[PDB]
Amino acid sequence: MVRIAVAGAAGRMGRNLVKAAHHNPVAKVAAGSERPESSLVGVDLGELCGEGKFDVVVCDDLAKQIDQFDVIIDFTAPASTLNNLALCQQYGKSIVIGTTGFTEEQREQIDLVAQQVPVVMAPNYSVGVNLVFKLLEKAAKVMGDYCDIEIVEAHHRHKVDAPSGTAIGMGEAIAGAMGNKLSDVAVYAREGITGERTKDEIGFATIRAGDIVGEHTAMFADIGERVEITHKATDRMTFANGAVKAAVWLHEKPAGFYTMTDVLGLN
Amino acid sequence: GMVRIAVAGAAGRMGRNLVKAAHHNPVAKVAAGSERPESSLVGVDLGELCGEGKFDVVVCDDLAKQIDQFDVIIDFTAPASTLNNLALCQQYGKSIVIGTTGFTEEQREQIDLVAQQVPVVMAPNYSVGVNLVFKLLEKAAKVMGDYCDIEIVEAHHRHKVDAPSGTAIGMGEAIAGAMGNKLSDVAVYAREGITGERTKDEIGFATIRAGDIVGEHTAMFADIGERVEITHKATDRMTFANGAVKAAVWLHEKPAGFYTMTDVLG
Amino acid sequence: MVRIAVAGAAGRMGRNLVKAAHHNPVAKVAAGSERPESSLVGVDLGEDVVVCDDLAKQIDQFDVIIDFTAPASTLNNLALCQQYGKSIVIGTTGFTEEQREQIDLVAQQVPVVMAPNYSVGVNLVFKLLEKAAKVMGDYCDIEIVEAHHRHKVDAPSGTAIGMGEAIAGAMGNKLSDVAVYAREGITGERTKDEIGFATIRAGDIVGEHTAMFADIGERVEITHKATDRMTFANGAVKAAVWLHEKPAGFYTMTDVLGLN
Amino acid sequence: MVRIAVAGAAGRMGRNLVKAAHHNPVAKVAAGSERPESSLVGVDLGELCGEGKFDVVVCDDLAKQIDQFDVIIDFTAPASTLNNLALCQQYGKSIVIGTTGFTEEQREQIDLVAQQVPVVMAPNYSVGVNLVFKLLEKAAKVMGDYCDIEIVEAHHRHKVDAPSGTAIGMGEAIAGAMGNKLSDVAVYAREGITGERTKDEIGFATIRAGDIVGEHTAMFADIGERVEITHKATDRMTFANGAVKAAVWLHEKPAGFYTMTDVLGL
Numbered sequence A: 001m002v003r004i005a006v007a008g009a010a011g012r013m014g015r016n017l018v019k020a021a022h023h024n025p026v027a028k029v030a031a032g033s034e035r036p037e038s039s040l041v042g043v044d045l046g047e048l049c050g051e052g053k054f055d056v057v058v059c060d061d062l063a064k065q066i067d068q069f070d071v072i073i074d075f076t077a078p079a080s081t082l083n084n085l086a087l088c089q090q091y092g093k094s095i096v097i098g099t100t101g102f103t104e105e106q107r108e109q110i111d112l113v114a115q116q117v118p119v120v121m122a123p124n125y126s127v128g129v130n131l132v133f134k135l136l137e138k139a140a141k142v143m144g145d146y147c148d149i150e151i152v153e154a155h156h157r158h159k160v161d162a163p164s165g166t167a168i169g170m171g172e173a174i175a176g177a178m179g180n181k182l183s184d185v186a187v188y189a190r191e192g193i194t195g196e197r198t199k200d201e202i203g204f205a206t207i208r209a210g211d212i213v214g215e216h217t218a219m220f221a222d223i224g225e226r227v228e229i230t231h232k233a234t235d236r237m238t239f240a241n242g243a244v245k246a247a248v249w250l251h252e253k254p255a256g257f258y259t260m261t262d263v264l265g266l267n
Numbered sequence B: 001g002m003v004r005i006a007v008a009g010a011a012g013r014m015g016r017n018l019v020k021a022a023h024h025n026p027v028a029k030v031a032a033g034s035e036r037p038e039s040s041l042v043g044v045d046l047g048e049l050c051g052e053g054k055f056d057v058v059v060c061d062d063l064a065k066q067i068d069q070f071d072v073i074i075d076f077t078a079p080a081s082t083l084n085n086l087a088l089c090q091q092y093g094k095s096i097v098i099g100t101t102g103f104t105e106e107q108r109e110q111i112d113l114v115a116q117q118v119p120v121v122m123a124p125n126y127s128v129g130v131n132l133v134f135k136l137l138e139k140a141a142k143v144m145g146d147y148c149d150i151e152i153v154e155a156h157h158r159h160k161v162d163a164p165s166g167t168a169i170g171m172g173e174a175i176a177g178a179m180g181n182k183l184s185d186v187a188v189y190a191r192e193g194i195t196g197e198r199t200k201d202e203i204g205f206a207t208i209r210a211g212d213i214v215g216e217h218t219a220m221f222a223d224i225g226e227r228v229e230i231t232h233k234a235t236d237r238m239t240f241a242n243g244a245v246k247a248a249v250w251l252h253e254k255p256a257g258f259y260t261m262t263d264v265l266g
Numbered sequence C: 001m002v003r004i005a006v007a008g009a010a011g012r013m014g015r016n017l018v019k020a021a022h023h024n025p026v027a028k029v030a031a032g033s034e035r036p037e038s039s040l041v042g043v044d045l046g047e048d049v050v051v052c053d054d055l056a057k058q059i060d061q062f063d064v065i066i067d068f069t070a071p072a073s074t075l076n077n078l079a080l081c082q083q084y085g086k087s088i089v090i091g092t093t094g095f096t097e098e099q100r101e102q103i104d105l106v107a108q109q110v111p112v113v114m115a116p117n118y119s120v121g122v123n124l125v126f127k128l129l130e131k132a133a134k135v136m137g138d139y140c141d142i143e144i145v146e147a148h149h150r151h152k153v154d155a156p157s158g159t160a161i162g163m164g165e166a167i168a169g170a171m172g173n174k175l176s177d178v179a180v181y182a183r184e185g186i187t188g189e190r191t192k193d194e195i196g197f198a199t200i201r202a203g204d205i206v207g208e209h210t211a212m213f214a215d216i217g218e219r220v221e222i223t224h225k226a227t228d229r230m231t232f233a234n235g236a237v238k239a240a241v242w243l244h245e246k247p248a249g250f251y252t253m254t255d256v257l258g259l260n
Numbered sequence D: 001m002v003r004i005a006v007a008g009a010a011g012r013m014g015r016n017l018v019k020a021a022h023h024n025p026v027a028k029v030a031a032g033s034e035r036p037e038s039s040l041v042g043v044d045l046g047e048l049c050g051e052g053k054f055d056v057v058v059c060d061d062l063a064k065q066i067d068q069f070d071v072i073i074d075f076t077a078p079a080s081t082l083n084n085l086a087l088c089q090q091y092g093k094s095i096v097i098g099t100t101g102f103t104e105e106q107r108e109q110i111d112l113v114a115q116q117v118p119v120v121m122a123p124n125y126s127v128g129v130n131l132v133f134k135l136l137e138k139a140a141k142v143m144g145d146y147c148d149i150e151i152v153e154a155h156h157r158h159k160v161d162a163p164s165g166t167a168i169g170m171g172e173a174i175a176g177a178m179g180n181k182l183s184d185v186a187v188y189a190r191e192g193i194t195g196e197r198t199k200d201e202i203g204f205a206t207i208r209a210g211d212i213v214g215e216h217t218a219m220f221a222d223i224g225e226r227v228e229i230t231h232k233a234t235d236r237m238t239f240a241n242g243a244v245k246a247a248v249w250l251h252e253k254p255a256g257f258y259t260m261t262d263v264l265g266l
């Protein structure tokens, strides 16, 4: 059975991850962390959740509990995740990363550690999104060369990064299937006099409001017609369940950089 | 030899666009045009219809009268009229591009039959995007169809007489086909009053008719907690007209058979 | 500081109403009921206060009942309100024509809020639809589209019907004269006056409604999306707060929100 | 009858404006301009429109034809429009402004000249958009205080300004009905680590692609529900017809700053 440490257990995803891992019968909630300054350190993981009591307490540092768990599920902040990634390297653990907003250099660092550590990383742990990446590739091969490509995403008021990791991933899939690099073509803001749109740009627009769990749309626009491919998540549990599945899959897997495409068999 | 095109129903919304499109395609000539026998626009020059100078061709009340002027009929009319033109094609060795929708199950079979002897292109949508969409729907249905609720929604202009659209039905066929089912086994075309709980296997159709919408289609694949939507929007009819004329060009001097836009493109 | 009794506290709505009332800082969860044969009875609302089998036992503890139960149960609570001078927010639906009349009668003596939808958004949307219908309705095609989860038994939705009624009403018409609920086969050309309804049933969708007003060359769409049933709960609690120390009468969400 | 000068007649809007003014029987196409460098100077406005001929040529400067027209319809560039505004003040001629992307100081200049010149100005000449402004006010009064407010717009690839004039107008109407100034609350770009959304902000998102004529959506989002008001324009003629209706209304009006709300009465 896989023993799961939930980083950032009081978070939006953290709470859902605890619930999901608990309810998966091939997984045990073995540990949980929060920020050292946090109000919820010392508390039982059942209690914060409010659902009865497990025999586990929220730790201020996962290093203290390394003998209780095999896999970290990390949906936190980039700095905190790099720490947990180091921890995995030092003590031979695995990690499922759902955190987004990494810089280009941090990503490379993750690829490096992933040579030695078994790592699952993805900007979205839902099945739909993974299918959407495949659909985008096919659309881009057929229409990309002749069309304007735009990505639009919406999320709740609390999301700190823009555009979403998923939006960027969408762009990467699109750019990749056309033989380009996203950073060459991406346009993240349009303000004032932008002039005429270039032929190759991939525009990003970002909506932050309410409690939206997550909507994404990739648009391919020609003259006279357009194609839109859209994903809508309505419950975080969709992500959490997929992450826990990833953790189960990852257990006793050789070190490397794995994506949800690998976990699901969607390549 | 350039393909000589007869435009059935030349005063129609599609007919006018088809005349313009065929004219502007340099590998095609507008050779003939038809209208309803009762029509106000019989006897009139096809150029006066478009405003674009005057061609040397008049709107006929019957294409049989002009059978020596053309190789291919492009037909975006009504099911009955199209079955007539299909017969005409069989009698005089012509080809036909069919854009007409709203055929019954039996009428369609008839078409498959005549298509053994006549070169026939038929499709519910002559735009490139819709065709890409059919392919995308097949990949989505393989991955999500078994566990998801599948719904198709379409919107068109007020004047459209048939519901749901031919394209919507095609979307259904592609979906059902990729899952090993027949659309007529699963399709639900209306929901009214107390329907009870949705069945697992049904493909629901919803239909909007309003304004001048040229055509929106959406296929939705819904699970618990997430949903995927694939959408096509047409904004100008010329998209369809151009694709139809491209089909006519491709069809010229092809052997008899039932061809689709998938074949015309690839 | 309004003291709220939640009828049927173990229900889908009851659970959300408890959460919503608790959350609202101008309201106190004072009491809660369940069916006498119910398991919840005796249990604390924590899952301070216990779930009672009968609200009559707890009348001193509350001012306003929020009732999203069954027509029979709601008529009992309405009688209770009359006997002990309490108020009631009714969210229960499915009442017969006679039952509604009974409610009208009790509402002469009891302060009563009743509405078929308590979400604040939807109620605003009805007002917005009236304004759009007055300006564009005469020359535009009007279509209503709704989407709901797989388990919903009725079509189109009650809200969709309400949107049609508000639109038809603001144009001086009766919805049943213009409504078209299904389009199948050869329908011929759309009529000028019809209001078309399209219905989607899929997944776990809580509820989307869209009214479209379409001309040649442009179109206006007014859309409401519910994402949690808490939206109905929050609005009911807002109605309870407003209803407190109001004189007796039949009030609707239009009155609570001040939409006139 | 009103005599209309169409500034920038070879433009996207210009071409539609010529067509619209022509087809309005209470209006005459009297004059038309273009950039002096332009390929289409000297050409007949009918040739440009591709509808017959009119006894009028595209001028490089409207000053050369001032006696000919009463009202300029200007959907060009901010600098060109300020020139035509000056021209109006000098020769006592009224103007309909559709141009967007003016700076704050340029819009102050326009209010000044509008004391002396009869001026219609609006970011959108369609009826639907104006109704939408009214709807947005009602929604803001009821939901604005407790909801997150977001505006999304999409337009064709060629549009040079962002966000659209119509989007800013939507923001102004929302902010105004809540007693705020849009420049205090507007957020026009979200890039990298933005942190948590503020309570008061009005976020703007902008899509530029294809030949899209114009979609706008104002969203009012709470916890558990959201309300969206959306406008879609599908043909430019919608704008052109409304601009020409504005020109007809503006003729023999006293000098003032007018909007489409005034022209229509709502």
Ligand SMILES: NC(=O)c1ccc[n+]([C@@H]2O[C@H](COP(=O)([O-])OP(=O)(O)OC[C@H]3O[C@@H](n4cnc5c(N)ncnc54)[C@H](O)[C@@H]3O)[C@@H](O)[C@H]2O)c1
Residues within 6 Å of the ligand: A007, A008, A009, A010, A011, A012, A013, A014, A033, A034, A035, A036, A038, A075, A076, A077, A079, A080, A097, A098, A099, A100, A101, A122, A123, A124, A125, A126, A161, A165, A239
């Ligand atoms: N890939 C996906 O499927 C997916 C899905 C959902 C969210 N996300 C992403 O995951 C991240 C978290 O999202 P959220 O809404 O749950 O965020 P949140 O702000 O609710 O929660 C983050 C949690 O991590 C905790 N944390 C921060 N630093 C820490 C440290 N050093 N040690 C321990 N705990 C720490 C915080 O206290 C907080 O509880 C975001 O970057 C979001 O974009 C990804």
Ligand SMILES: NC(=O)c1ccc[n+]([C@@H]2O[C@H](COP(=O)([O-])OP(=O)(O)OC[C@H]3O[C@@H](n4cnc5c(N)ncnc54)[C@H](O)[C@@H]3O)[C@@H](O)[C@H]2O)c1
Residues within 6 Å of the ligand: B008, B009, B010, B011, B012, B013, B014, B015, B034, B035, B036, B037, B039, B076, B077, B078, B080, B081, B098, B099, B100, B101, B102, B123, B124, B125, B126, B127, B162, B166, B240
């Ligand atoms: N596959 C596609 O890409 C596509 C695109 C557009 C329309 N369509 C379909 O094509 C059909 C036409 O749409 P539309 O707007 O062009 O219709 P429309 O009503 O504007 O025009 C159809 C024309 O056919 C003419 N007609 C009818 N019977 C005739 C006869 N016996 N002989 C000669 N002329 C005849 C009518 O007089 C009319 O002018 C519809 O079935 C529609 O659903 C398909």
Ligand SMILES: NC(=O)c1ccc[n+]([C@@H]2O[C@H](COP(=O)([O-])OP(=O)(O)OC[C@H]3O[C@@H](n4cnc5c(N)ncnc54)[C@H](O)[C@@H]3O)[C@@H](O)[C@H]2O)c1
Residues within 6 Å of the ligand: D007, D008, D009, D010, D011, D012, D013, D014, D033, D034, D035, D036, D038, D075, D076, D077, D080, D097, D098, D099, D100, D101, D122, D123, D124, D125, D126, D161, D165, D239
């Ligand atoms: N209010 C509305 O309803 C509305 C609707 C559509 C567009 N617009 C606005 O109109 C403006 C232009 O619109 P477009 O899409 O038609 O632009 P466009 O570039 O297609 O056309 C602008 C035309 O103005 C001409 N022009 C520029 N400088 C000139 C000068 N000094 N003299 C004469 N002509 C000159 C250009 O050559 C060009 O043909 C934009 O700012 C746009 O946002 C407003």
Ligand SMILES: O=C(O)c1cccc(C(=O)O)n1
Residues within 6 Å of the ligand: A100, A123, A124, A155, A159, A160, A163, A164, A165, A166, A167, A213, A214, A239
């Ligand atoms: O791709 C992302 O950035 C993402 C995915 C799911 C949820 C969230 C979030 O809620 O922040 N963000």
Ligand SMILES: O=C(O)c1cccc(C(=O)O)n1
Residues within 6 Å of the ligand: B101, B124, B125, B156, B160, B161, B164, B165, B166, B167, B168, B214, B215, B240
């Ligand atoms: O698939 C269809 O049925 C269809 C496709 C394009 C246009 C139309 C139409 O305009 O009627 N109908």
Ligand SMILES: O=C(O)c1cccc(C(=O)O)n1
Residues within 6 Å of the ligand: D100, D123, D124, D155, D159, D160, D163, D164, D165, D166, D167, D213, D214, D239
């Ligand atoms: O609000 C605007 O700026 C606007 C409105 C309509 C059309 C256009 C355009 O096509 O540029 N721009």
